[PDB]
Amino acid sequence: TLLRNFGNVYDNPVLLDRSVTAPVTEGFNVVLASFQALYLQYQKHHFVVEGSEFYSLHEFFNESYNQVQDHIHEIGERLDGLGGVPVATFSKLAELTCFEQESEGVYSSRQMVENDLAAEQAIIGVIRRQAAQAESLGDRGTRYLYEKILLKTEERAYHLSHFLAKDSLTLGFVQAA
Amino acid sequence: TLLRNFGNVYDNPVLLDRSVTAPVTEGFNVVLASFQALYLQYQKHHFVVEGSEFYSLHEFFNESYNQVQDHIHEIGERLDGLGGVPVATFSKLAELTCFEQESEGVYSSRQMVENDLAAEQAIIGVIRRQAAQAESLGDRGTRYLYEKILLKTEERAYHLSHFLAKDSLTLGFVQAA
C-alpha cells in the first residue's frame, strides 16, 4: 500500500502553491530521467572507449558521469521535498528522457563524443525552459538550482566540442583527409 | 562615542544608492535577527532532545544550527559592507525576529520539530520578499546571496517535514492511533 502515488504532487513545507510545484516537479522528472540516461551513457563510454586518446577520454567520461550523478542527487531531493514523486523505473525513465540513448554496442570515439554532446544539448534546452518556468512561477529556489546545473552542463558541452575539433599535434606528420 | 548609529545607513564602496542599501540592509537585519533566533532554538533542541530518535535528531539539530550560523555570517558581513549596522542586542533581536521563539522548557520531539519547521517557514517568507526587493532594486549581489540561503533553508524544511511524516519501521509491530 502506497504513501505517494506517481504523477501526483503532495504537500510541501516551503509555502508554494501547487500551481507552482506541480509543473516544477513535472519538469524535474524529465530532467532527472534525462540525467539518468546520460549518466548511464557516460558510464558506458567510460567502460568501452579505446584508441589513441583512450586515457584522456577514459578520465573525462568518468568525471562527467560523477558530475551528472551530483545533478541527479540535488534534483531528486528537491523534487521530493517540493511534494512530487521522483521517477526510478527503467520504463518510465525511458518515456521521460529528453533524448534517445545511444544504442547497444561500442561505437567509435568520435561517435561517442558526438552522441554525448547531442545529449547535453537536449538537456540544456529543457533546463533553460524549466529555469524560465520556475522564474515566472516565483520558485527562485528551483531556478537557482537549475542555473547551477546549467553552468556545469554547458561546461561539459564545451569540453565535448573541444574533443571534436578538427585539430591535432599529429597533423605535423600525418596526412590529412 | 560612536562610528555608526543603529538604524542608519552609511557610505558603501560598491556604487549603490541608499534608495537601495537602506531597504536592503533593513531586510538583512530582520533576516539576521530571525536566524539568531533559530540558531538559538536549534541549538537548544540539540541540547535537550531525547527519546527513540534522539541520536538522529541530535545530529540533525547540530547540523542545522551550524548551517544557520553560516547564513548569519554572510549576511552580517554584507549588511555592514553595504553600510548598515548589524543588530546584536538581545532586546533588539527580539523585536526584529520574524517568528516567536519557542518558550523556555523542554517540549516533546514532535513539538520541537514542528516549532522549527514553522520557524524556517516564516524565514522563507521574508527571504522570498527580500530577494524580490533586491531584484527590483538592482542589487543582484544581495539577491544571489538570498537565493543561496533560500535553497539551504528550504532543504532544512524538507528534512524537517520528513521527520514529521506519519510513517515508521515500527508500524510493522506496534498499534497505530
Added chain:
Amino acid sequence: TLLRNFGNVYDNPVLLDRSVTAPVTEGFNVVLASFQALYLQYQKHHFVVEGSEFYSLHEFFNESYNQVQDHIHEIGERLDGLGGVPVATFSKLAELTCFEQESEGVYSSRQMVENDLAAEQAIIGVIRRQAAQAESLGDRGTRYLYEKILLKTEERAYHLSHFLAKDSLTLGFVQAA
C-alpha cells in the same frame, strides 16, 4: 504541552543528588547566557570592525567567538545531562547574563576591545565561583569542565589586553598624546 519546566531540575543518570545539580545547573545557565551574549558581541565586532588594524581584529573576533561557541556547546550539553533546562529565549538570556552587552551601533576599535575585555572579566568572575562551588559540592566533572573553559577565557583576556597596550610601530614616526 511541556515535559520539563524552566527553573526546575530533573532526574540525572550520573548519580548526583539534586542538592548538587540545582545550583550547578543554575550557575551553568548564568554562564551559558553570558557566553551567548559574548558570542553575539564578538560576532558583531567581527562584522563591524574597521580601520588600520581591521584585518587582525577581524580574524581575532572570528577566532574568539568560535571558541566561545565551543564553550556554549559543552556547557549546554552538560547542563542538560545533569537534569537541567537550558536558557534559550532572548528575554531570559538578557536577565541571566552577568554583563551588559555593548549597545547597538558601531563603536571604535579600542572601545569594542575594551568591552570585550570587560565581558570576559565578568565571566572569569562567575566561572571561578561556579568552579569553587562545584569542587565544594563534589562534582569533579563540572569543576574540571569549568577549568578547561577558564584557561581559554583568561587567554582571550590576555590577548584583548595586548591590543589595548599603548605601543605601536607607528610611534617611531607619528606624534604622541
Added chain:
Amino acid sequence: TLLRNFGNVYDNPVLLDRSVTAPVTEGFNVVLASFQALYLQYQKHHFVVEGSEFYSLHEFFNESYNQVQDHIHEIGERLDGLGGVPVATFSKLAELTCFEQESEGVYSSRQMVENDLAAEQAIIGVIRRQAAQAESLGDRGTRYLYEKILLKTEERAYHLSHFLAKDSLTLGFVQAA
C-alpha cells in the same frame, strides 16, 4: 621466566611513594577490568542490535566502545608507568570488574541500553572514589586523568539516558501505554 608479579607494585620513575602507587594501581586495575567488560559489552551490542533504531544504536555503540578503548589505553599505560601490573587474563578481569556483564545471548534494544547505562553508572562510582583517593595521596596526574575520563563517561551516561526517555516522534500516530 617472570619479571614482575601481579599484585605487587614496583619501581616508578616519577617520585611517587609506593604507598601512593599501590592503591592507585589497584584502583587502576579495577577501572581497567571494568572498562574491558564495558568494551566487550558495547562491542557485542554493536554486533547484535536490531530494530527500527538499529542504525542509530549500532553507530552509537561503535563510537562508545572506541571511546572506551581510548580510556583503557591511557589507564594501562599509566598503571604500568606507575610500576603496576595491568590485568589481562579473562579470569582475573572477571573478578576485578565493578559490574556483572550482560549474559550471553541477545537482548532487546531497550534492554541493551539499560545494561550499558547501569555499567557506566557503576564505573562512575569507582572513578569518583579513585579520583578522591589520588587527590588525597597527592597524585595530581592520576586525579587529572580520572577527571578527563569521568567527563566522557558521564557524557556517555546522558546519551544512554536520552535513548531510554519515554518520548518518540511515533507518538503522534501510534497508541501509547
Added chain:
Amino acid sequence: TLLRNFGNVYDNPVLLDRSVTAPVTEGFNVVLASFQALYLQYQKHHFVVEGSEFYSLHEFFNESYNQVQDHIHEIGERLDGLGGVPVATFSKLAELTCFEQESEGVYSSRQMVENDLAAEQAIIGVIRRQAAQAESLGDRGTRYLYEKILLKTEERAYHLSHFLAKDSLTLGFVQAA
C-alpha cells in the same frame, strides 16, 4: 596559420545565437582584461607594501589576487566555450581594461588601497551591466557566473574600504590630524 581570429565569434555547443554570444563574449574580454590588470596590481602591492600594517596588507593583497585569478579562469573558459577568443597580449589587455593601472613605482599603503578600491569599483560597474545584458539576452549561465563573481568582488571592496576607515587602536595614544 589561425584557427580563430581575434574579435570574431565562432560556433558554440550550447545552442546560443550569436546575437547573444557576440556581445556576451565581448563583455567577457573587457572583464577578463580588467581582472588581469587588477591581478597584476594586487600582485604588485603584495610585493611592495610596507609599514605598520604590512603583514595584514601583505596577506590580504595575496588573497585578493588569487581570488581574482579564479575569476579570470572561469571567464576565460566560458568566453572560449561560447565561441569567442580570449584576450592575452599586453597591448590588447591595455586597450580593453576598464580602469587605468596604477603607475610604476611604490606608493603609500593608503594610496595603494585607494587605487585597488577604485579598480574593483570600475569592474563592479561593468559586471552589473554585463550581467543585465546577459539576463536580457537569455544567457542565464553567463548571468549566474557574473553574479558569483560580483559577490566576491563586492566583498573585496568592502574589505578595502574597512582598511581605509579613519579609525585605529593607536588613536588611544597618538595625536590625530
Added chain:
Amino acid sequence: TLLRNFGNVYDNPVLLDRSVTAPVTEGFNVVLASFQALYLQYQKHHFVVEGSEFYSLHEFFNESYNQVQDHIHEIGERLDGLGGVPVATFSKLAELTCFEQESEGVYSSRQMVENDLAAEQAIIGVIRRQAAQAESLGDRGTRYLYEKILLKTEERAYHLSHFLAKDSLTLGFVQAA
C-alpha cells in the same frame, strides 16, 4: 528476557541453509574468542614491554592489537549476520579461545614475543580449517573473509618471527652465547 539464546543459530537473510550457518558460526565464535584473547595479550604487551627494543615493540604491539581489533569487528558482524550469537562474557571467552592466555605478570620481551607468535600460530591453524570448511559448505563470503584475515595474521607471524631471530647490530661489539 532474551530474544536469542547463545548456542542456537537463527534465521539469516543471505539464503544459506542452517546446515551451513550452524557450523560456520560455531567456528566464528571460536575465532572471535581467540582474537579477543589475543587483543588483550597484544595490548598488555604494549602496556608493559620495556628494554632496549621497547620503542619498536611498543609501536608494533599497538599496531598489532589494532589490526586484530579490525578482525574481531568483521567476524562479529558476519557471525550475527548469519543468524549467530556472538560470545562476549569473560567466562565463555576463556572456554572458547583456541590458545591459553599468557599468565598475569610481566614476562621478558622475548617471552612476550614468543607467546604472541604461538598465539598467532594457534589461530592460523583454526582459520585454515574453518576456511577449508566454508569452501566445502558453499559459503564463499566466509571463505574469502577468512583468507583476508589469514593473510594479515600470517604477516604478524613473519614479523613476530623476525623479532626473535638471533641477529643484532650489537653482535659487532658484545659477546655471543
Added chain:
Amino acid sequence: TLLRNFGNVYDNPVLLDRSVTAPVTEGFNVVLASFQALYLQYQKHHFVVEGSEFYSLHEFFNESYNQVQDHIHEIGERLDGLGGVPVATFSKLAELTCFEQESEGVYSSRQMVENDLAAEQAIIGVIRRQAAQAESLGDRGTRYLYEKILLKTEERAYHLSHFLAKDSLTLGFVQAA
C-alpha cells in the same frame, strides 16, 4: 659471513610444510624478478615516451610502475616471510624473469605499449600457474595474494590493449590506412 643461501628454503613461522614453501618461493622469485624487469621497462617508458599522446602515456606509465612496485613489495615480504630468499642481483633477475626486456635505446609509442602488453601477458601466465600450485598445496594466503595481483595485472593489460586499438578522434579529419 652468510646466514641464508639463495636457492634453499628455511624456517617459516606459519605452519606451512617446506614441500609447500619451496616451490611457492621459487615461483615468487620468478614473479618477483619478472615484476622487476617490468618495473624498469615501465620506468624507462615513462622517461622516454614522446609524441602527441606523450602526456597520457607518460602518466599512465608512472601509475603502472608504481602499481608494479606495490606487487614487488607484497611478494618479497611474503617470500622472505615464508623462509625464501628474494632475488636481488642484476644477473640473477635476468635469468628468472619470464619475459625478455625491451632492448636499450628508444622505441616508438605503439612499440613501447606492445612490449609492455607482451610483458604483462607473460606474467599473467606465471601467476595463474603459481596460483593453481598454491591452491593445490593448500597455501591459501599465497593463492589469495596472487589473485589480488592477477586482477590488477589483468586490468593493466586491458588498458594497454585499449591504447593499441585502431581508433582515434583524428580519423575524422586524417586519412586512414
Added chain:
Amino acid sequence: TLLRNFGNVYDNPVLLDRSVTAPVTEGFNVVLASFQALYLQYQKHHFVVEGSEFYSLHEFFNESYNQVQDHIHEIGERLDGLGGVPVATFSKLAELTCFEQESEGVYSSRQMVENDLAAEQAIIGVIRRQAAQAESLGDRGTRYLYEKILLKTEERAYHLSHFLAKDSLTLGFVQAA
C-alpha cells in the same frame, strides 16, 4: 605621491652593496616581465586548446602556468627585498619581456606548443646569464633562486619538446606525411 621611483634602487637590509642589487634587480625585472608574458600565454593556451589531445594539453598548460606563477611570486618578492621596484604595467611589461607573445587569436596545438617552447628557451637564456651575474657579484641567494627556477623551466622545455616529437599511437593505422 611617490615613495620609490621605477628604475631606481633603494636601501636593502641584507647587507648587499647597491653595485650588486642594481643589475640583479634589473635582471629580475626582465625575468619577472617575461614570466608574466609566459603566464598569460600558457593561460590562453589553457583556455583555447582544442582537438584530439585537448584534454592532456589543457591540464598541462594549467600545470605550467601555476608553476610559472610561483616563479613570479618568488622573484617579485625578492626583487623588492633587494630594494628594487617591480614592473607591473602592461606597457613596461611589454618592453622588458625577452620574447614576443603569440599574437591574438587561436593557433593550432602544434603552434601553441611551439611558441611556448620558444618563450621558455629565451627565458632559459636570460636566467643563465642572470645566474652567472649573481654568482659573479657575490649574491648566493639570487644565484640559488635562479637555479631552482632554472631546473623547472628546463623541465617544461623537455615536456613541450616531447609533445612536438613526430610519433603517435595513430601511426599504426593512419597515413604518414
Added chain:
Amino acid sequence: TLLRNFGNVYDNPVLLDRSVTAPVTEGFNVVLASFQALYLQYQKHHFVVEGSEFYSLHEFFNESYNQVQDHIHEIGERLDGLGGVPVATFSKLAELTCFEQESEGVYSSRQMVENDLAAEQAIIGVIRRQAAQAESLGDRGTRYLYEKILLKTEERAYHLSHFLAKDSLTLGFVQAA
C-alpha cells in the same frame, strides 16, 4: 628603553591579586628555564645519539623536544599574560633552570637517557610544588595548566625509564653481566 623590568610583576587582565601573580610567575620563569634547558638537551641527544637503538631513540628524542616546546609556549604566554616578564637570556636561563645541563660532548646513549630522566624528575618536583602553590593561592588556571603538563612530563619519564630497563631481545643469544 624598557617597558617592563625583569623581576617585576605588572598588571594583569584576569582579576588576580599581585600577591598571587608575583609568586606564580616567579615559578613559571623557573619552569620555562628548566624546559628551555631540557629542550636543548633533548634536541642535542637527537642530533648525536647513535648505536643499535639509534633509530628508536632518534625518533623519540625528536618527539620529546617537540612536546617540551609545546609546554614552553603555554607557560611563556600565561607568564606574560599574568603580567610577568619571561626569561630569554642564556645567562639568566642557567641561573634559573632547576637541573644542571648535560656537559658538552657526546655521552653514551644510556647516559643520555639517564640524564634526560633525571632532568624530567627535577622538573616533576618543581611542577608539583608550583601546582600545589597555585591551588592554595586561588589560581585554578595555572593549577590546571600545570596538571596538563605534569601528565605529559610524567609520561616521558615512563618512556625514559623503559628504555633503561635491563631487558632485551638479544638476551636470548648474547652474554649477560
Added chain:
Amino acid sequence: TLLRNFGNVYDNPVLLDRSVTAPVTEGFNVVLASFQALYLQYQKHHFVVEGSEFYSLHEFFNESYNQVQDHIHEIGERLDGLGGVPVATFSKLAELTCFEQESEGVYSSRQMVENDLAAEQAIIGVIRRQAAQAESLGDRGTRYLYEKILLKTEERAYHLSHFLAKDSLTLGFVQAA
C-alpha cells in the same frame, strides 16, 4: 663516561677530509648557537609583544622562530653527521653566538623588530662567510644547505625591514613627526 669531546672532529661517513669537516663544523656551531639565540629572542618577542599591531607581530614572530627551529635542525644533524659535536649548554651558546641577545625585560615593538633585524643581519654575515668556506674546501652539501638557509634568512630580513618602514594607513588621519 664521555665518547666525543667538544672541540674535536671525529670520523665521518661521507669522504670529506678532516681538514674540511673541522672548520665547517666550527662554523656550524657558530651558526647553530646564533640561531638558538635568535630562536629564544623571537620566542620571547612572541610572548611579550603588545600594542595595536600585536596580532600581526605575534604571529609573525611565531612563524619566524618556527622557521629558525627548522634551520637549527638541519644544521645540528649535518654538524654531527660530519663528525662534529653540536653546542648545547647555555654557557657555550652564549660565547659562540654572533650577536648579543636582547637584554631581559620587555622592550617596545619597534625595538623588538629592530633587534631581530640586527640579529638576522649578523647571521647573514656568518652564513655568507661559511658558505664561501665550504665552496672553497669542496663541501657542496654544506654550501647548498647554507644557501637554502640564506634565502629564508634574507627573506625574514625583508619582512622585518618592511615592519619598520615609516608608512602606515594611520597617516591619513593622525599627525606625523
Added chain:
Amino acid sequence: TLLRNFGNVYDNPVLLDRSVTAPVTEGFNVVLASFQALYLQYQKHHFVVEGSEFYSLHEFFNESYNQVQDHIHEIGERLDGLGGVPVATFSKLAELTCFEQESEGVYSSRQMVENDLAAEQAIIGVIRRQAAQAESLGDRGTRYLYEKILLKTEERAYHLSHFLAKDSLTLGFVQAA
C-alpha cells in the same frame, strides 16, 4: 625499429652544446645504474632484515629505497630531457653501476648496513665529480640537481654510520668485546 640508439646523445630543447650533454648524460646513466642497484639492495634488506633491531631497520630500509627511487626519477627524466637514452636492461645496469651489488643470500644486519654504507659512499664520489664537471661545462641545472641529491645521499650515510656505531642501551647489562 628504434628511434634512438643507446650510446648516442641526441638533440635537446634547453640550448646546451652536445659537448656538454654528451658527458653529462653519460654521467647520469652511471648514476641511474648505481641508484637502480642501490634501490634493489635497499629493498632486499627491507625484505630480509631480522633480529632485535629488525623493526627500526625495516622502516629505515623502506624509507631509504623510496628516497632513492625519487633520485632515479629526477635523473632519468633530465637524462632523457638532455637528449640522452636511459639504461634499463639488467645487463647494461651491471656494467654501468659504480659499486658491486651485495651477493644473493641473506647476510647479517650489520653486514647489510655496512654494504649499504659502502654503496652510498661509492655513489657520493661519482656525484661530486659529476657535479664538478657540470659546473665547469656550464650546466647549472644538472649541477644543482646533483647537489640536491648529494645532500640526501650524504644523510643516508650519516644514518647508516650511526647504526654501525659501537653503542647500545644493552651495554648496561650485557658483556662487551
